[PDB]
Write an enzyme that holds these catalytic residues in place. Structure first.
Site, PDB file in Angstrom:
ATOM      1  N   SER A  49      19.084   0.842 -43.879  1.00 29.17           N
ATOM      2  CA  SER A  49      18.538  -0.363 -43.274  1.00 29.17           C
ATOM      3  C   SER A  49      18.303  -0.237 -41.770  1.00 29.17           C
ATOM      4  O   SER A  49      17.744  -1.169 -41.180  1.00 29.17           O
ATOM      5  CB  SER A  49      19.441  -1.559 -43.577  1.00 29.17           C
ATOM      6  OG  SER A  49      19.463  -1.830 -44.975  1.00 29.17           O
ATOM      7  N   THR A 188      22.875  -2.043 -38.250  1.00 32.34           N
ATOM      8  CA  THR A 188      23.644  -1.247 -39.195  1.00 32.34           C
ATOM      9  C   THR A 188      22.756  -0.656 -40.288  1.00 32.34           C
ATOM     10  O   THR A 188      21.613  -1.077 -40.500  1.00 32.34           O
ATOM     11  CB  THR A 188      24.729  -2.106 -39.846  1.00 32.34           C
ATOM     12  OG1 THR A 188      24.114  -3.265 -40.411  1.00 32.34           O
ATOM     13  CG2 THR A 188      25.756  -2.547 -38.821  1.00 32.34           C
ATOM     14  N   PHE A 190      23.491   1.586 -44.401  1.00 28.60           N
ATOM     15  CA  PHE A 190      24.434   2.113 -45.399  1.00 28.60           C
ATOM     16  C   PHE A 190      23.618   2.511 -46.626  1.00 28.60           C
ATOM     17  O   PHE A 190      23.048   1.644 -47.295  1.00 28.60           O
ATOM     18  CB  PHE A 190      25.479   1.051 -45.726  1.00 28.60           C
ATOM     19  CG  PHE A 190      26.452   1.407 -46.826  1.00 28.60           C
ATOM     20  CD1 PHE A 190      27.041   2.663 -46.903  1.00 28.60           C
ATOM     21  CD2 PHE A 190      26.844   0.434 -47.727  1.00 28.60           C
ATOM     22  CE1 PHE A 190      27.963   2.945 -47.888  1.00 28.60           C
ATOM     23  CE2 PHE A 190      27.773   0.711 -48.727  1.00 28.60           C
ATOM     24  CZ  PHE A 190      28.329   1.959 -48.806  1.00 28.60           C
ATOM     25  N   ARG A 232      31.968   2.171 -39.198  1.00 23.42           N
ATOM     26  CA  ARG A 232      30.695   2.475 -38.553  1.00 23.42           C
ATOM     27  C   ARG A 232      30.520   1.704 -37.249  1.00 23.42           C
ATOM     28  O   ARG A 232      29.769   2.154 -36.381  1.00 23.42           O
ATOM     29  CB  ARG A 232      29.525   2.197 -39.500  1.00 23.42           C
ATOM     30  CG  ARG A 232      29.222   0.723 -39.696  1.00 23.42           C
ATOM     31  CD  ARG A 232      28.238   0.494 -40.805  1.00 23.42           C
ATOM     32  NE  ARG A 232      28.247  -0.904 -41.233  1.00 23.42           N
ATOM     33  CZ  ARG A 232      27.376  -1.429 -42.078  1.00 23.42           C
ATOM     34  NH1 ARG A 232      26.405  -0.677 -42.597  1.00 23.42           N
ATOM     35  NH2 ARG A 232      27.477  -2.709 -42.398  1.00 23.42           N
TER      36      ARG A 232
END
Ligand SMILES: [Cl-]
Length: 246
Positions: A49, A188, A190, A232
């Site tokens: 993303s 972020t 993932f 993260r």
């Protein structure tokens, strides 16, 4: 970028949680950057993303996103996360990482225009094969931490090959902390938990404006268990705190 210097002292924040990853931090510009792991800094991973940043710019550039106040309406049909099951602004969709909103943006951009803009942006290996609505989630697109900070610095400077107004629109959508003399833009990502012997990747990328200085950063780590995901943010935050950035 300019010079990059490996600083193995930062590895203390990784080994504490047995994490394999890299942090890249550049002060002022990509003139001078530091990393804990020079080899991994140049290794390319699925953007997941974090790709919403170029995808949003391309959507605006192509007119698929009509303007910064477009509302992305929910059709009422189930979505994979409850936080996506609602009408969203552009900023909202980025901030909750509403994959289905950006999958439809990508479909409407189309493969010809998507390829053109990833070339213009020098975005990773620029490989969009594997399906127009999933190449950044499970396809062949790959980008390194070094490349992320170069891309983000270009965005910060409005030097991407896109209108300045579209770059400014996406930048306001990326603000995640605002104080009088402290401003954070970040995103972020993932990919998932991967498969046996092939971990997934988690990302945190962005920049910090503190007083009259700016710091660009990109973090990624191997991940095979979703319980480790908050690392993260916490690992790079601990590193930036130890550098006096906070
Ligand atoms: Cl969904």
């Amino acid at each position: 970028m300019g010079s990059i210097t490996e600083n193995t002292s930062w590895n203390k924040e990784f080994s504490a949680e047995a994490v394999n990853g890299v942090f890249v931090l550049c002060k002022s510009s990509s003139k001078s950057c530091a990393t804990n792991d020079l080899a991994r800094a140049s290794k390319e991973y699925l953007p997941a993303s974090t790709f919403k940043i170029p995808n949003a710019i391309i959507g605006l550039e192509t007119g698929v996103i009509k303007n910064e106040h477009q509302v992305f309406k929910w059709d009422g049909k189930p979505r994979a996360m409850k936080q996506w099951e609602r009408d969203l602004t552009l900023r909202g969709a980025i901030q909750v990482s509403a994959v289905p909103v950006f999958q439809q943006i990508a479909r409407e951009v189309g493969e010809v225009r998507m390829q053109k803009y990833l070339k213009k942006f020098s975005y990773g290996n620029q490989n969009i094969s594997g399906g127009i609505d999933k190449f950044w989630l499970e396809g062949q697109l790959r980008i390194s931490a070094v490349n992320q900070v170069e891309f983000l610095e270009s965005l910060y400077l409005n030097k991407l090959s896109a209108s300045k107004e579209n770059q400014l629109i996406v930048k306001e959508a990326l603000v995640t902390e605002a104080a009088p003399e402290y401003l954070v833009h970040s995103k972020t990502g993932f990919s998932g938990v991967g498969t046996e012997s092939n971990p997934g990747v988690a990302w945190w990328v962005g920049w910090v404006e503190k007083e009259t200085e700016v710091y660009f950063f990109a973090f990624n780590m191997d991940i095979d268990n979703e319980s480790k995901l908050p690392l993260r943010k916490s690992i790079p935050t601990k590193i930036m705190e130890s550098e006096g950035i906070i």
